[PDB]
Design a protein around this ligand. Sequence first.
Ligand SMILES: Nc1ncnc2c1ncn2[C@@H]1O[C@H](COP(=O)(O)OP(=O)(O)NP(=O)(O)O)[C@@H](O)[C@H]1O
Ligand SMILES: [Mg+2]
Length: 330
Amino acid sequence: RSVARVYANVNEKLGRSWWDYDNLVVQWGVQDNYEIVRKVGRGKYSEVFESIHLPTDSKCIVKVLKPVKKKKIKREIKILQNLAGGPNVVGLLDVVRDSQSKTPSIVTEYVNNTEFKTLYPKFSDFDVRYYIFELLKALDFCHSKGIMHRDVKPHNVMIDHEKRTLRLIDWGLAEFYHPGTEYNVRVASRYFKGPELLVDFQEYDYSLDMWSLGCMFASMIFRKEPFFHGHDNADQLVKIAKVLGTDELYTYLERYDIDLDAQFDDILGRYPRKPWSRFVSSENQRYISSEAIDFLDKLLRYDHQERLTAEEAKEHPYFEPVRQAAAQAS
Ligand SMILES: Nc1ncnc2c1ncn2[C@@H]1O[C@H](COP(=O)(O)OP(=O)(O)NP(=O)(O)O)[C@@H](O)[C@H]1O
Ligand SMILES: [Mg+2]
């Protein structure tokens, strides 16, 4: 009912030793070589602390998972070990757990982050092209290794603006992509969910991450956080419909034999396509160019087979300032 455009082969061509995370045996580190300092974050199934690896006296992150669904835990570890050394992927330092409760933690590199609603308004046009390009690098890498993040959003993009470095964190929803598999649609955060998630289409792929990338980018360049502000998961589809249009939605559902749910009959009207240019303001004009709008317009498409691949998106003209800049550094 849908295969991915790119990289569909990958997990088949790497081994079952690459994707079969149920049978991974975890060689736990020593829980007591870490000391938790201060709370830096929270989560649905987690808590995150700044911490010290005692034997080296060094800063790191300790993220304490919820111990149940044991294989959901091995999934995140198998993905982190697989993506070892990948450009702009958060580095895995250790996996430890408590001797008595068997509650596990993942230990990752620390990144001196600025929270995005503070940091994003401080970006220049170049910053945006540059940090999106760096993030495209992580997305392309893990996609080319047969993995979907499925929770791309600002909150999982650590930026050390002083170091001009980027890390994609939180692979607790990352699943391996197997052609034709029916994945769970209850993934990603509301404001970054794809239309395929919102209409219960289960045979999605690496293109889901591109719709989310486009939701980030849209809010960066139009200065509208979040860009699609649905009150529930049904309102999410209507808020997207008010921009992309109800015509192109109906052609896409037909293209995929998706039958919309009956709740939508009363809430989903006929909406015309609002051009991207109506989101241009004076406060957000610094980020606007035709390169940018064109690029956003090829991320944010109902049909996931119409979205750019992360590889394709790096080729985009928008990023040419970044390409040539890094080349002249060379
Ligand atoms: N390497 C890191 N460096 C700095 N801060 C980090 C790092 N990893 C995580 N954090 C912080 O911890 C928060 C939560 O981390 P995360 O790994 O997304 O846990 P989570 O339980 O999966 N949260 P959620 O996004 O709701 O699923 C982030 O939003 C960051 O502020
Ligand atoms: Mg998570």
